[PDB]
Write a protein that binds this ligand. Structure first.
Ligand SMILES: O=c1cc(-c2ccc(O)cc2)oc2cc(O)cc(O)c12
Ligand SMILES: O=c1cc(-c2ccc(O)cc2)oc2cc(O)cc(O)c12
Lengths: 115, 115, 115, 115
């Protein structure tokens, strides 16, 4: 799989478990077309979202449902969700890890792009 | 000034100047209506986006045009933009500062909410 | 004011108030000599630590007492403190803002260096 | 191994490879005693630093030589190094991952503590 999502919890110092993640691909008419989704595992990771054959060049949006995550922990959050929007490019390395570090009023995200 | 945006550059250790910012508000029909836009000053700050009267309750999206920023500096970055999505003024008027710290393959964002 | 420290709380979405900060400078004998100290205000800022005359070239350590901050709020955090270590004024006098964003098991820090 | 260090590069969107890491344990006289060290791998990770038997409760410092890393890439950095100082506690989960995300004028660090 060319796309993995990893989510961490900066309040508890843990993986962020059972977080819903939705991936969209930008269509020709600039709408967001559902592409893949899942929930992070006990290690905070979401594997197997797509395949090399399906993951063609284009703009993708990864939506991480941070609000539901914080509410399930009894914590009041700021954001509706975290969004990561990027272009997949065949010129670069083949594997994309989208990582996010979550706090109630803040988040960080980085891309780790490797061969 | 109930909505302010502040952007920093983590490569240069400086304000991120001339960063375009577009704000949207979710409409009754569930689309993103353009609400306000502007660009960061030499201090990396964007003031005057809206007014207390105009900044009513709603779900807002602050889109920070990070790709256009990096590309204007001769850099090819990872993200298209940073999107900050939040419910505002649910418990009455507040003042919101949306801060963002930018790197070519990573960003963080935090909200400072007062009064 | 050539050295300023600003601290934010990522759990509350607020300035981090009453955070103790201790600054050290590496001595000729390679030990950390106490240089200045203070605490953040209601704005999360710490001004007046030093003067242009006193803030000479050197290697400085800014220790932000994050554990004491979280514990004063009834929270058991991970880190003892955040340490920011840097060479200052190597190319002549500059103004340094050390910013830190705090969560119980995570922090970030960035420097804004001007003139 | 109860202690792992992971380092990421926010400029290149990659693991931070061949970064020197030094771990110290705080001695009874408040000095820092060398404990373990190594260099991050091609995946940006440093495994096998210590064992369960050696990693007793106490205060530890993880020093990440960020300055040499940026210089080897031809980039001018701000910090001398990144420091992560924490107490190992047997009450919590047994495995500590210290992660750091590096930019030239900024870094983030979080702890992922698991069983
Ligand atoms: O999101 C951030 C915002 C800020 C910041 C820094 C200075 C301000 O006057 C306002 C906000 O610093 C930071 C420092 C970091 O290391 C990481 C951040 O996300 C931020
Ligand atoms: O976005 C982040 C991702 C990670 C990370 C941690 C472990 C992985 O296997 C992959 C990514 O650590 C971090 C540590 C930080 O202090 C801040 C981050 O944004 C991240």
């Amino acid at each position: 799989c060319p796309l993995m999502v990893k989510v961490l919890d900066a309040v508890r110092g843990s993986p962020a478990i059972n977080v819903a993640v939705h991936v969209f691909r930008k269509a020709a008419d600039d709408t967001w077309e559902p592409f893949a989704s899942g929930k992070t595992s006990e290690s905070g990771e979401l594997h197997g979202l797509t395949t090399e054959e399906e993951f063609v060049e284009g703009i993708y949006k990864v939506e991480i449902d941070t609000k539901s995550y914080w509410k399930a922990l009894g914590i009041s959050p700021f954001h509706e969700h975290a969004e990561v929007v990027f272009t997949a490019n065949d010129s670069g390395p083949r594997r994309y890890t989208i990582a996010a570090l979550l706090s109630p009023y803040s988040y960080s995200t980085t891309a780790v792009v490797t061969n």
